[PDB]
Every structure is written in structure tokens, then in C-alpha cells.
Amino acid sequence: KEVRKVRIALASPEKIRSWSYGEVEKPETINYRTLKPERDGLFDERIFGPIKDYECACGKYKRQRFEGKVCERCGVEVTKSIVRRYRMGHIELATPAAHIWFVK
Amino acid sequence: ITIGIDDAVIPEEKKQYLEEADRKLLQIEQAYEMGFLTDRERYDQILQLWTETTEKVTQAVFKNFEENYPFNPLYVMAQSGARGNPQQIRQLCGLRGLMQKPSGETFEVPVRSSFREGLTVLEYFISSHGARKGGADTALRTADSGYLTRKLVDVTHE
Amino acid sequence: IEIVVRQMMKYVEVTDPGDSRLLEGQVLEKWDVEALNERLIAEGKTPVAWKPLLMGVTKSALSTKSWLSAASFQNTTHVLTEAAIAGKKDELIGLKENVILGRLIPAGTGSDFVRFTQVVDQKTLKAIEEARKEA
Amino acid sequence: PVSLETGDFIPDEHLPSPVDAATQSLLSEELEKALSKLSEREAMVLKLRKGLIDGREHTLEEVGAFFGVTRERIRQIENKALRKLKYHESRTRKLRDFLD
Amino acid sequence: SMARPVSIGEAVGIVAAQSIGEPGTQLTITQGLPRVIEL
Amino acid sequence: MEIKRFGRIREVIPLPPLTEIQVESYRRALQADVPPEKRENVGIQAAFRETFPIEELVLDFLEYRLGEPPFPQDECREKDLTYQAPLYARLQLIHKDTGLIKEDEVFLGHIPLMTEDGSFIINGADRVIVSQIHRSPGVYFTPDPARPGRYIASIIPLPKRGPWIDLEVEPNGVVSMKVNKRKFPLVLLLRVLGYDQETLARELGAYGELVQGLMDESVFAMRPEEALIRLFTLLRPGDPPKRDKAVAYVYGLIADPRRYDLGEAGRYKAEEKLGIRLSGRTLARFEDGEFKDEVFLPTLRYLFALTAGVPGHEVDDIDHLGNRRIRTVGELMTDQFRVGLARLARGVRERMLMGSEDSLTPAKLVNSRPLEAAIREFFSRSQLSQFKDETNPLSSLRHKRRISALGPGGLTRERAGFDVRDVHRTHYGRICPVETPEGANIGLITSLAAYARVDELGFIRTPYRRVVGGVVTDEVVYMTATEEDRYTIAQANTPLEGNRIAAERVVARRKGEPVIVSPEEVEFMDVSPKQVFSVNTNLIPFLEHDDANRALMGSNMQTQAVPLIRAQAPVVMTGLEERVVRDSLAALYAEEDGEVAKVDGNRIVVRYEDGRLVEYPLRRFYRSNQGTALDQRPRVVVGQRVRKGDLLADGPASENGFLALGQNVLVAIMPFDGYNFEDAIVISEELLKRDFYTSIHIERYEIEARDTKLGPERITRDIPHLSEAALRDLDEEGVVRIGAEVKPGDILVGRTSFKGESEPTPEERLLRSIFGEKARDVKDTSLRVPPGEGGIVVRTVRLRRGDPGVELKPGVREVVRVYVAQKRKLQVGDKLANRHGNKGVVAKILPVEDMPHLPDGTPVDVILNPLGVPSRMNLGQILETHLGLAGYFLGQRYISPIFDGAKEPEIKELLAQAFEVYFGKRKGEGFGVDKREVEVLRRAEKLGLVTPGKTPEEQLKELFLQGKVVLYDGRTGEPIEGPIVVGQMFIMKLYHMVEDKMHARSTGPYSLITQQPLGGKAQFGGQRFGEMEVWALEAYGAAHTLQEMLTLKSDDIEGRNAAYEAIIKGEDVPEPSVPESFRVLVKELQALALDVQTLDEKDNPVDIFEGLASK
Amino acid sequence: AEPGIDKLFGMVDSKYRLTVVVAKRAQQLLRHGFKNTVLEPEERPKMQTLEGLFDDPNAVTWAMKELLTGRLVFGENLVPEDRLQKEMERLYPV
Amino acid sequence: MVQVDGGRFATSDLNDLYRRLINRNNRLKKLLAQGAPEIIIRNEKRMLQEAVDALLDNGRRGAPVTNPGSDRPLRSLTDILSGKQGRFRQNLLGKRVDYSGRSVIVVGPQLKLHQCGLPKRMALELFKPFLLKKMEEKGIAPNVKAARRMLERQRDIKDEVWDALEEVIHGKVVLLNRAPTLHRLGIQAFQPVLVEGQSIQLHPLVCEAFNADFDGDQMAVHVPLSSFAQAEARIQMLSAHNLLSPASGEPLAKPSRDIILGL
DNA sequence: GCATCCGTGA
DNA sequence: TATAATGGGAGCTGTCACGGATGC
Ligand SMILES: [Mg+2]
Ligand SMILES: [Zn+2]
Which family, according to the similarity comment (chain A)? Predict the structure, then answer.
């Protein structure tokens, strides 16, 4: 299909969760030794996808013969790493917070 | 076609107009010292006098050029529209003219020198105010020009 | 200058709603209120009483129907919030929209008027003609 | 770490360049051109063995059981296929430039 | 530019905006550019 | 050759040291040569004295000291270190309860030392601290723009020295004071100071209606204590009004010398303006438990007096150079030092709490880190600390004399309107009206005048000769602008017989205003016209014949002059081209009298009168910041007797002690075949033949081999998959040999880096299987020559790990630098300019036979178009050309001072003397006048140039005196139809060259986030197609070109890949796809909790992420 | 200027339509390898090489000249797209 | 979070903002699970709101959150979207493009109005893929990879590739542009004429349109790829095809300076 | 009905 | 893991204009 109209609208919490591929529970980014992403972190591969194309974290499934398959060990789906520019995460707040755009 | 320093030709009329303006200036000062006219009116009369004087020496330059030296480089370039305008040529041959203070106020004394004769450090310093103000005006103008242009583009784009 | 000024006079303000859903003081495009008025007057309903409204180029550019253009101009936050609240759809009428989207602008060679033009040689044209004549 | 905004001068090493992608495409196409000079069977053996098909590299027992031959037979025809590939390569010198 | 009736599909608004804008840096007893923006 | 100087003006004083604004400032700041006990309280000393004692245990300051630099300047430049000295501070920790005293000298880190020429070396790079002009501290009174008959009193201290208090008279009648955006009745603050209604009534009562507005009963009813608490409640809402907190806050805000500092200059200005005396730099004091007033009452009195119209009270001009001062290197550095010291003091106070309260030493209590951090921050990341301009000696010399209104504690460019940018009447002799940048920075960035010098208070002073009676003394008085306005100052060119004024009427200045005055009325007189203009501006001969706007460009572009191998001083000088080479330390001179012992290319050895043998090393082919080669050549010979101050070696861009910014060429002013159309320039190939405008340029390349988790990076001669042809010029270690010629693509330094772990594609598996060759463990990272660059490698520097004297940054095993030099001939696209503001790129290089030539057979060099002259109104180049013709045939050069020049008649004389040599030679050689000369003379007399009836020689001389000659076209042989101005002009090759600026890209690196091409030549980036270019393509109506720009050529991944593949395959380019940056926009809008949906005509969602972002 | 650009501007009601026509025709010539051309061998645009005169590789020049000849028919809805593509592929294989 | 050339790490401010948010959130959840007093919980919640605000739009309310030891405000999402440097104006309404170049302009008098002098090397890089195709067509290279690896080194470049380049660019045009672009004639189409030297040669008559002179001005070259873009440039954007101002209708490219003087 | 701060833009 | 200790420190000033909401 060809793009015709472009719509913008408010996003419900349920919609935000619908976008999200997982929740980030930790402030950690990557490991200070291995340089690999921390689990439940901002760079976590379990959430936002694989760093390398069609290869999981631990490297159990390294090729395209597995696609859409989520490794049981590291928990990283095997697909094109381009998805790391795409897949959203989320953060569940203990208390609601007002969007400053609709306040100020 | 070339340009020598003699190619800027100071008219004989110049000195005459200058001396006339001098005696006129003296008359005005005399009229002021006897309390006939205020400082304002005196200043205005001096400015007007020097403006008309400037016009006269300009016309003198271009008439001398037209009649005596029709193929003169400055004259040719100005007439054909190749380069230059009457005021710049006037600055090259006749007087540089009146200059203004940073406040916009004009100095009572004009620059009697031309660029061919060369100026005096005081005259040069007096002109520098105007030059600087002009440069600043240009620089500050470009930005607003661009902003306006972009506003217009955005409103008219569809 | 008449083009720009034309874009300056683009908006009107409602003096009386009539039978419409519009409100007193509400500002909208002249085209829309004229279409609304001709739709109401053909329906046998009291038309909207409006007033010509002149606004400067900035406000007029920010007041456009396209939220992509308005957001790409200035006051991105304001524009985007009001648009998201309104659930606005950008129909990609103007140039800026299609530029941002990276599409072919609706002008020049991208104009629907000249866009669908076809070219064919007489040989192929005739061959195709004979092909369609045998069906 | 230091802030990126202090990032416009920093290249992207990850995504393949147009030149690289084009080179990989020409590589695949030239490889198919060279594999077309074999029989479909001995080409299929190499495609199954080196993982050009399905992505996995098959053992000699699997290709042999697939074609219905002995693993020695499949290894031998793999060898002769590779041999014809080497001869065709020595002749046409096509795949040398892709060796970097 | 062509001294003939304009071709359909010509982008008029941009040409207008540019036509007004380009001389702008030249605008100087005169009100000038601030007057232009004021208008 | 012979040097003939003109002008009648005798300057009684020489130009001051030009770098003194830097040198003396920093010297005064450090006081390194002053024994500690004898140090005045200023600069670093003032910082220590202001910070200490630290009260809380009591830590006090005794004295400091600066050690010797750990490394010499050259070695610092080499090793990327900073030229600096260790700073030690003797401190005694005193326990006031015990009486215990522990004294120790603590090491506070290093401070950058200034070099001899007034610059710095920071991390190996030469830098310059630009002086900053700002509003001088003090008390000012300015007209209130709202209420005409009312005024605003402003009390201004130094930057970051405390707030700006604003006294104003409100419409209700009460006097208001404004501090930190808060406004309160001044009466309260007056009551806090201990003032009573009686005292205010008697003091201010002279001015009738204001004092009643000052009267508030409720305030006078309460004692200063309750008024203090009240004021604290007004200033600090929500904070409990504890009395001690109120005292602390109010004292800290006003009376605290630590938190609040008026300038010493501010102190003086306040004392002078208000007519009072300050006990300190604070507006008030805390004495005997209470607050005592200093400033506020006199200022309030003055305000009321100015409002009332009491004579003797004036409003202040804030643009006046008496109200504006200069913060030099020493002051800025001292400020940052004071900040770091304050932070260190906070650390110390924090350390006096924790730990053992008994055993502590000054060493334990002091952490030097904040200080080091502050100073380093200043010299590294500050705006006023600028990368030094070394292009030519004059570049740096001018750079050091720069005055900026920008920087920290200064104007924003957008905060600056006409007023700040304007040339004030007080700029005379102080700030050059000519030389300022052309652009947005105009008027904000300026230059110090030649005779101008900054005083101790920070104000710029200019020299004036005392005139007593009608006699002009030789004594000079440097005056501030405020002091300058007091007298009547005659011009420098006023007629003089001996020391007496010879004119009945003289031209003078009263408060800057020009006036005609009698010799009895002359109090002072200008020293020289030179004082009006900066150094660069003073280098433009016939400056009075040039329009200011073009002279600006002349000045500015002299700075851009590239040092040439053959570089020579101008035939027409201003007389300043010697001294400039002296003050910029590039040129080498003899210390005392003596005989030269040795002369080499590397060094010069001199034996002085003392008998001591002094060896001077010469800097040879050293790369400056701009890449221009700085090199010294010996000007003397073995056994030559020299005196004190005599030239030994010539610096870069200098000829025999005179400044050489370019070459003297033979120029003809005339249009040539549209090749000089619009400022373009045509030059002779003869210039390239004799190596005129040829300059050496050095570029430095650098690479690092570090430690990786994938294994070490190695610098080696072993590079995978390379032939011997590629490795030819590399030595055993992998570094290119010295003397080799490198071109684009060549390897300067071989390097191998372990490949990132990756699974080889099935294609690679099959390929490897076919060729039977294992994939190497390492990849080729080798440093190569960037496109468009190259040359001969003149140097290599290698620093490893484990070798003595070197430690790199953590992780780095080794670092290699390669210095490559190139000899650049003049070529099409290079920029040339003269001193008068005539600039142009060379658009054509003709062979010698195509060049217009003199009848004797001498071809010209440069052909300039006359169309540049009239509109630009710079006539100085013309006169320079005429006198240059005279000087060409007379074999001599000239010195024409600024505004006292060689005038027309004298040039006519010299031109006649020249014509005798030019012609009489011919007539003696047995040659008569040419036919073409006859025709040209006919047309010339048609023009009215020569008087009809005279002999051909007389007419040719009449032409020659006009500076015009007969010129033959080299192509035709036929003469030009008229006489053309030809002569010697001084032209420079500017730093802007095509070799540097040419760039082209097909495809290359893309940005991380946006996936758009990079930018800059170094990164091999693409050209920016902006909003305006899009407007261009839109207005043209080209949709597909624009779409190509938006997609296929940028940021559309699939699109650009498919496009390149299609082009290399010969196929036409494919339909473009969605730009990646739009996807980035969508996702960045999602992070803002805004749902952005692309819809079709059916309003059904369209997925541009192709299912990858959806679960 | 392009040779006979004025007649070309005369052919169409809008210049952009001319652009579209030229571009599309050029794409036809490129895809079909110029063997679908309406030009006679002596009308073929020529290019000077070191060897000698060859065919002009530029398809746009060809398209403009072909347009000038008048042997090209342009307009809207002349023929369904797939039918045109397939018939041209039948007459001039790729 | 990416590793730069020197093995050092660089990261966006959004990461630090997110970390702030997560830390304050988790501390809030722990404070709630431990039943902290209402004061502490109030303060924590307020800090959480301050954090979310700082993330979405920084400096919008209260003091802008800065990284330690720096006065520079972190870059929030609002700061990324809006502004002159914002996503829209910087990366959307305009882009840096491929197949483009830049150099110093010089006046060719000899050029026809529709022509421009183009340096050899510049054109070799700009047309490079076409040149690879042509070189593969002729006997200069076995294939594209070989030709490109051949062009990589300058000393590996022979004289036939220049002729092939001449074959490549024949009939095609390029776009010259000078900043600032104040109207549609700030970009114009010219037939490239290969020249020795590093300078772009510009026809005199168009100088007035670009407001270009020879005092050291520079211009940018762009190469339209598709036959469509090339048609657009050759017809609509060609210099000789626009002789009149779209503004006043008067002649734009007309005799000036030297020309007027001579005539 | 009108003065009073703040917010966004080069 | 145990002497006792119980509201924080920088702001920082020579821009111009209209769109709000306040709110004098
Ligand atoms: Mg220019
Ligand atoms: Zn796994």
C-alpha cells in the first residue's frame, strides 16, 4: 500500500506497552568488562533485539535458518540487527507522571 | 582602458565652490553671533549649504568629464553602467562630503579632501564612524532578511 | 506579494454559528466556512455569519492545516500537542510534508496534471492497436 | 564515557556501505555463474555442504542420504565438483578479485 | 522567466517567497526592511 | 639598494613593545622574579591572600613559589605537553585552642608559563589569550528610557564578583533598590546601615521633593536589627529569619570582600565620580558588630542631585573608553585561579571536620585537584583562549593585540547591537577604527592601536605631546579618554618651525570634536598619525587614498599572508616593516657587539666583546599551526663584524630584517579577454618559472596502536594481501622512509588490527574452499594519505611502551607521527591580494609570449582589471604602482609613512628620473620611436593625455609622468589602443588555496543515528543540501532531482545501495524508499508518547518499519 | 541551450509534461537498448571518440531529438501499462 | 553508546536521563515497599516528576539538568526535535548528499552559457560508478572491483580512464550551487567540460544570478542520477534556458562589466 | 480596560 | 553496626518581537 495520510495522536499507556518489547528495570548500560549489554538494561539485547545479524547473545543460534526463534539460554531473538533502531522499550512508573508538554 | 591617478580629474570649479561655501559659512556664523538664528537653524543651514555644495561639485565633475574628457575611464565606466556611480566618482574627484557621528548626527565640518588628494587622519577617523555603522547595518540586516525569507517560504509553500 | 498577502487573509472568525456546530469567535479557513455555508444553505439551514481575519505570515504559517509543516516551522511543542490532542491527519497537500516524508512533491514533474503522461512510438502504438482490435 | 553532543563526526561502522553490498551481490551472482558450469547434482552437493542453501553446512552423511548415495560417493562428487570449480576458476580468473 | 503563460504545476509560492526575499539584503529617509517585516 | 624615505613628521617616541599587553600582564600576575616577601598584593598573590586564612583549626597562607619548567618549550611542543611551572605554597596549620603549629610546603600543581613572544603552549599546541573589553566597574547614572525626567543609578562590580544594585525613583515617590531581580525600598537598607531620619533629612534635604519620598516612619521606628531581619525576610522568603543568618547573608551580599569585589579601577571610578574615598572595594563594612555605610549614600545623593538638575552632575556614556576597560591575560587567569582556590578552600573546610581533629598536616588538608582543573579548564576550553595564528609573524603579533567583547562574562553576539559595535569618539589613538572582522563579529572584535598601551587599572591610554605657549615639548603624556577630554589636542601634521607652531590656525580636538584653534589655545598635540591605526593598518601605504572598507580588508588579509621561499619586502613601505619583524621574535639578532665565529644552515656561532662564545640554533622547516613552514636562514657570513641589535638570521616571511608578506611584481592595469572579469586575476608563467609565490607547507599525520580485547594493534611491515609495490617505501618497522614521495592511497604507517569475530558467509565458505587459502586473523588498518594530499616525508616520530622517557594514555601501546612536506607553486584557484583590499583568485596562467609587454621586450607579471578600482574606491594601489614604476627603473625602494606620505609632485619627479633611464637608454642604443608608439600617441592626444605638437619623446614622457606606458599585445604584436598604467605592486599569496579546498565524493561514511553522509573534507563527507537548496529545486519544479537528494543520495539505505548497484551494472536507478531519518523521527516521537501513523487512502495503517518494530 | 528547445516547449501545454515525456522515452530506450528507436541510421545522434564516431550513449538527447521528429505520440491513457510493457517486450526483447 | 576511534566510549544524553529516571523510580518502589513516611515519599515522587520532565523536555521547568562538572544542559527529546539544529530542519527538510563536491570558482570566458569547467579528479570521483561501468565495458578492467581497486591509488591511474570518463559524462549535466541560495537561480545546470586544474570554471553571465565573484568564492557540484533528474536539469534547470528573472520578468543573464565596457 | 513577566526564535 | 552529631548553596545581568495568561 502507498502512504497517503499521516496521523498523530495521544498514546495510551496500553499502547505504549503494546509498542514495548520489554521493560527496562535497571539503569545499567553495558558490562564494564565484557562491554556486552547488561540484562534488563537500556542496551539489553533481550528487549531491543540482537547486536549482530541473525545471531543471539550467547551465540547458540548463529544463522538465518533460525529467524523469529528466541534462544532459551540468552533470550535473544535472532533477526536483523537493524531492529535496534526500531524496537521500543518501556519503564513502568510507581506513580503517574504528567507529560510536561500538556502542562507547561 | 586603464586607471591612473590623473584619471580622477579635480575640476577647477571645486575650489570656487569651496571658497563660496566658506564665505557663506562665515555669513551664517555672523548671523548666529548677532543672535538672529538659534543653534538649530544655524546647524541646519550649514548642513544644507554643504549638501548643495556637494551636488554642485558633483555636477562640475560630470560636466567637465562630458565636455572635456568624454573617454575618461571613470566617466566611461560610470556612464556605460560597467562600474561605479556618480557619488563614488564624486568621492574620487570632488569632495568626500559630509560624515555623520555614531549618534546619527552629522558633523558641521565636511571632508573637503578627495581620495586622489588623500584625506587627513582626522577626516579618516570621522568617516570611519559611518563605515563601521554601515558594516554593522549590513551584518545585522542579512539575518533578518533570511528569517523573513523563511517565514514567507513557510506560509506560501503549498 | 499578492500571493503572500493572499496567504495572510486565509482565515476568518465566526460572528454567529447559525445552525452549524461552530462557535462564536472560532477561527477557521475561508474555504471551509464557505463550503460549510453552501452546504447549509442548500440544506435549508441558517448559514454561518463570519468576518474576514488578517494575521501575519508567522501566525498564518503556524495556523495551516498541515501539522507537519507547522511543526517543522516553529513552536514544535505547541503545534504537536494540539495536533496529537486533535488526532489530526496530514493529507500531504503541500511541499514540506512530502519533503519530510521523502516523497515526490506535488509540483513540477510531480504534478498530477503532467505526471501520468505516456509516450509511445508509432510502430508499437499501431501494433498494440491491432492487438486490441482482435479482441 | 564522554557525551556525544559535546557525534556528527562519528561514522557508522555497522551498516554495510553501498560498495560492500554491491560487491556481496556480485559475489553471489558470480558464484551462481560458476556453479552453473557444474551439473545440478554436483552443484547441489556443494550448495548443501557449504551452506548456501538453508544456511546450514550439511555433513557428508546428510547429503549422501539426501541424494541416496554412500558418503564416500558424495564426498567424491563433492571433490570432483570442487575440482571443476578450480579448473574453471584457473581458466576464467573471475573469482580471484573477490579474494581481497 | 519564460515571458509566456505559466505552466501548470509550477510552484508559485516558493518563487514568490524567493522573489521577495532575495533583494532583502539590499534594503536600506527610508523605512526599509524593518518596515517590510512590519507589513 | 637605495631606500628613500619621505615625510616631515618627526616622532619623538618609538612604538612601544607590541607584545607588552600580554608579557607585562602575565609577568605582573605571576611575580615569579619577585622575592616572596617583596611581592605586592596582586594576581596570584592576591588570590592566595583573598582565599586565606581558612577559618572553619585555622589554615593560613605564608608565601608561594614557582619552580623551573620540567621541559623546554620545543620539547613540550614535541611531546604534546604543556609549558608550565610547579606551584608550591607554604602553609601553616594553626590550632587556635592549642597553639599547635604545623608548617609545610604543599605542591598545588602546575601553572602555564608564557613564552617570550607572549603566547602559551598547551598540550603541545600554541595558544593565545585574547584581551577582553568590558564595562568598567563603578557607579554610573543613565537616563531612564521610560520616565524621561528620571534616572537609573547602577552600581557595577567586577564579573562574578557580586550583583548589580539598581537605584531608581519609582512613580509613587519612594526610592527603590534592585538586587537579584528583587526590588525593595532603599530606606530599609539605609536603616540597616544605621541611618536615622535626622541624618537623612540634613544630608539629602537640599533636594526638596525626593527626601519626603525617602521618608518611611515604620522603618525608622525599628532599630537596625529588626530592619535587618525584615530585609532578610524580603530577600529570602521561606528561610527562617535567624539573626545570625541575616547578618551572614547581608554581609556576604554587600560588605564581604570575599564574595563582593568592586574593581580597583571600580574603586577609583567610584571615588572619582561620587567625590568620596573608599576604605575598601565593598559597598559597606561590618565593624564593631554593626553595618557601616560606604557607597550607597553618596550614590543616592548624586542620583537626587542629577534628578533635581543640580549643576556639576552628568549622565555617563557607557561606550566611552573611560567607562570601558580591558581585562588582559593576567586578570582572566587570576580570576580562574581564584575560583579554583575557592573550591580548594571549600575542600579544606570540609577536611577540617572529618578525620582526627588532632593530627593533621597542611598536606593532608589540601587537595590541589580543583585548582589544577580550573586553570586547565581556562587554558584549554575557554573562548578567550584561542588556537594561535602563526601563518606569518604578523598574524601572531596581531592576534596578541586583539581585543574581544565576547567570551565568558561578556556580550552575546545577539546581545550586541549598533552601540557596542560603533566606533566611539574615544577610540582615537586607542582602538583602531579600521581593522575589525568582516562579518557578524564586526565591531565586537577589534585591535589595539600602535602607540596605545593599557595601564594598571585596565584603561587604554594614548600618548600626547605637551604644548606650552606655542612651543611643543618632547615630553609625552599617556592619557585615559576621560583625561583626554579635558584638553585641546592639535593634529600631528600641524606646521612646525623648530619646536614652535608655525600656523596661525591649527586643527585640534576638544572632546573629540574637530575645531580650529589658535596656538595659544593648544595644550597638547598628536605624536604621529600612526597612533590612530593598528599595526596591520599601519602597513598599508597611501592609506589616506584608500576607502576605509577596503583598508579593513587590506589589514585583515595581511594576516593571511603565506610565507614564501623567495619572499621580499614591498618596494613601497610604510617604515613599520622592520620593527614588526623585531617584536615578533621569528627573526634573530645579535645580543652585543662582536664577530661571527661560525655560519651554518643549522646554526650561527657568535663571539661577543665579552669573549664568550654564544651558539644560536636555527629553527629549520618547522610546521606552524596553519601548516605554513616556519624556518630561519642565516643572513651573515663567517668573520663578519656585527653590532648590538644587528641581524643574524632572517625569520619566516622576512627579507633582511624587513617584513615580507609576498612579492613585488610588474603589474599592468587593463582588462584581458574576460579572464580578469569580476576580480579574477591573470598571471605570468614566468612567476612559476622563477618560483615566485612558491611556499612550503607541512602536514602532520598521526596514528595509534593500542590494546584491544580482541588482541593488540601492531605497527608492522607485514600487511595482509598487499604486494611489494605497496610496501616499497616502508622500513622494517612499518613506518615510511624519510625522503620518499607519497601520493593519495599510499601507506604512511602500516598497521594490523585483529578482526572482529564474525561467521564467514556461505559465499566466503565456498570462496575459501575454492582458493584453499585461510582467512587471516588480522585486518589492514594502516594509516594512508588522504585524497588530494601528499608530498615528501620529512620526518617520523615513534613512541612505544617500555622505552625510557615516554608514557602514553592508558591502553595505548605506541604512537607514530609522520611529518610530510610539499612545495606549493602558484596555481589557478589560489588567492592573491594587495595591501589596499584588492583581492582575487588567479583565473588564468598565460605563457610569456601571450603576456602584454613593454616595447623593450619586458613582459608583465600580473594583469589587474581596472573595473575593481572605481567602485572599491581604493586609490592607494594606483599610487603604489606609479611609484613602483619609478622605483622599478631607478632600482630603488621607498618608505612612505601613513598620512605623511610621498605626494604626487615628488612621484612625478621620480617618474621623470625613471623615464630618463627607460628612454635615454633606447635613444643611445640607436633606436628611434616605433610606429605603434606613434599610433598610440595619436590616440593619446585624442584622449587629451598629451599636449599636441610636442616631439614623440616629450609626449611619451608626458605619458610616463601619468604612470602610463606603451604596451604591446603579445598575441598580435599590435599595440594596445591606449597608454596603460604599468608598475611594481606588492602582492601577497593568501592562505586560501585550491589544493586544500577541492573536494569530491561519490559515496562514503554515514552518520550513526541519521544515516546521512558525514561532512567536512577530512571525513570525506558530502555537500549539505539545505532547506534553501530544497526551495531552489522546488521553485524550479524538479521533483525527481529533489527526491534523489532526499532519498537515493542520502539516508535511504535500500535506495542508495540499489542505486549504486544499478549504476555500476548499467541499469537505470530504482524507485526510492522511505528516508531512514523519518523512521528516526517516528521513533523519537514515540518516545514522547505521541503515536505517529502512516495511513493509506482507506485510513488503514501502513507499516514503514516492515513488521520489525511490531510484535 | 538544447537544440530546438523552443519547438519542444511549443509541443506541450506544460513544460513539465515535456520533461516527463523525454524522461520516460529515455527510459524506454535504455531498457530496450535503443533498438526501439524511431530514428533512421543517419538521424542517430553521434559522439566523437579517439577511435571515431559512435552512437551517443545519452538517452535523453536521443529522446529530445526523437520528440523533435514528431514520430513519437504522447498523452494520457494511450494504453494500459502492462499491455504496453509486454508488447514492447515482445517487439524488442531484453 | 559507541566506541570511538581511540577506543574511548561516547554516549547520548538520553541514556543519562533514562538512568536518572530508572534510579529515582526504583528508589520510589523500594521506599513504598518499606513503608516510608509521607514526607520522604512526597519528595521522591516530586523528584520522579522532575526526572520525567527532564527526560522529555529539559530546562522547560526549573533548572536544566546538567552532567557533573559541566554547565552544558543535557539534550532531551524536545531539544532533538526542535530548533535550527533540530531533527526537522537539520535532517529532514535538508540533508547532506552523496555524489557531490565543492571547489573554488574561476572564470572561464571560453565557456558557452550552458557550460562549466569541471576539474578532472572531481568528475572522476563524482561520476565514479559510471566510470567503473564504462571501464568494465572497455578493456580497462576485468570487473568493477578491479577497476575500483585500480582507482584507489592515484599512481595506478592511466590515460585511458580519462577518455572513458569523457565517454561517461557526454550529454549529461551537473548542478552548480552557491551559498546562500536566495532564489531558484542559486542552483543552475551546466554541461561539464573536463579541465586540468582543481578549479571550477564558471560562465561570466551567470555570475550575477549566483551573486558570485572571483575574490575566492566557492561552489558545490551535484550530479543528478536518474534519466528523470537529468531531464529535469537539462530542460528546466539549464542556465541557457533561464534568461529572465522570475521576479521582475527582466533579463537576468545580460552583458556586464568588461562586456558592457567593450561594446 | 491596561500594565506586568515569561517563553520561544536567530 | 553504637561518644555525638538534626533545613543548601550559587545566582550573574548592554536582544527584540508579539502570544498568551494573568491581575494590576
Ligand atoms: Mg565574493
Ligand atoms: Zn542464545
Answer: Belongs to the RNA polymerase beta' chain family.
| CB of D5 less than 8 A from some CB of H | yes
What are the backbone angles phi and psi of residue G59, rounded to the nearest 5°?
-80, -20
What's the CA gap between F849 and F684, in Å, rounded? 9
Helix (H) or strand (E) holding F596: strand F594-599
How many structural domains is chain B composed of? 1
Architecture of domain G1-94 in CATH?
Answer: Alpha-Beta Complex (3.90)
In a domain, B157, yes or no: no
The answer to whether residue B88 is domain-embedded is yes
The rounded distance, in Å, linking the Cα atoms of H28 and H44 is: 6
Confirm whether B7 is domain-assigned. Answer: no
Strand I nucleotides within 7 Å of a protein CB: 8-10
Query: Is D94 annotated in some ligand binding site?
Result: yes
Q: Calculate the angstrom distance between C1' of J21 and CA of H87.
A: 30
What whole-number distance in Å separates Cα of residue F649 and Cα of residue H41? 77
Element (H, E) at F85: strand F84-94
Query: Cell numbers of H165, please?
Result: 570518463
Cis preceding linkage at F762, omega within 30: no
Ligand at shortest distance from the CA of H180: 1
Residue H166 φ/ψ, nearest 5 degrees: -60, -40
Q: How far is G53 from chain C (nearest CA, A)?
A: 26
Name the residue range of residue B62's domain. Answer: 12-139
Looking up cell 608559563 gives F113
Q: How far is G93 from chain F (nearest CA, A)?
A: 16
Q: What is the largest CA-CA distance in chain H?
A: 96
Instruction: Please state, in angstroms and rounded to a whole number, the distance separating the CA atoms of residues F334 and F342.
Output: 12
Question: CA-to-CA distance for C34 and C38, rounded, in angstroms?
Answer: 6
What is the dotted CATH code of the domain comprising D16-96? 1.10.10.10
Query: Do F482 and F324 meet the contact criterion of CB atoms below 8 Å apart?
Result: no
Residues H183, E8, F1027: CA angle, nearest 5 degrees:
30
**Amino acid at the residue F1009:** I
Measured CA angle at A31 (ends A28, A33), to 5 deg: 150
Contacts made by residues F687-693, CB under 8 angstroms, sequence distance 24+: F687/F826, F687/F861, F688/F825, F688/F826, F688/F845, F690/F566, F691/F565, F691/F566, F691/F825, F692/F564, F692/F566, F692/F663, F692/F665, F692/F826, F692/F861, F693/F564, F693/F662, F693/F663, F693/F825, F693/F826, F693/F830, F693/F832, F693/F989
Q: Give the distance, in angstroms, between residue F797 CA and nucleotide I3 C1'.
A: 71
Count of positions (residues) in chain A: 104
Q: For residues F693 and F990, what is the distance between their CA atoms, to the nearest angstrom?
A: 10
DSSP helix/strand/coil, C20: coil
Alpha-carbon gap, residue F963 to F945, rounded angstroms? 11
What single-letter amino acid sits at F356?
Answer: S
Kindly tell me the burial class for residue E38, based on how many C-beta atoms sit within 10 Å of its own C-beta (0-12, 13-18, 19 or more). Answer: exposed
* DSSP summary character for residue H244: B
Please give the grid coordinates belonging to residue F760. Answer: 564467514
Solving technique? X-ray
Has residue B38 been placed in a domain? yes
Rg (CA), chain C: 22
- Known binding site: residues of H? 213, 215, 217
Q: Which ligand places an atom closest to the C-alpha of A61?
A: 2
Q: Using the CB atoms, write b or e for F426-455: b if 16+ within 10 Å.
A: bbbbbbbbbbbeeeebbbbbbbbbbbbbbe
Record: contact H67-D3, CB cut-off 8 A = yes
Q: Position F1007: which residue type?
A: S
Residue type, F588: L
Residue F603's H or E segment, with its range, is: strand F603-608
| Separation of alpha carbons F774 and F846, rounded Å | 58
What residues are paired with F752 via a beta bridge? F714, F780
Task: Give the length of chain D.
Answer: 100
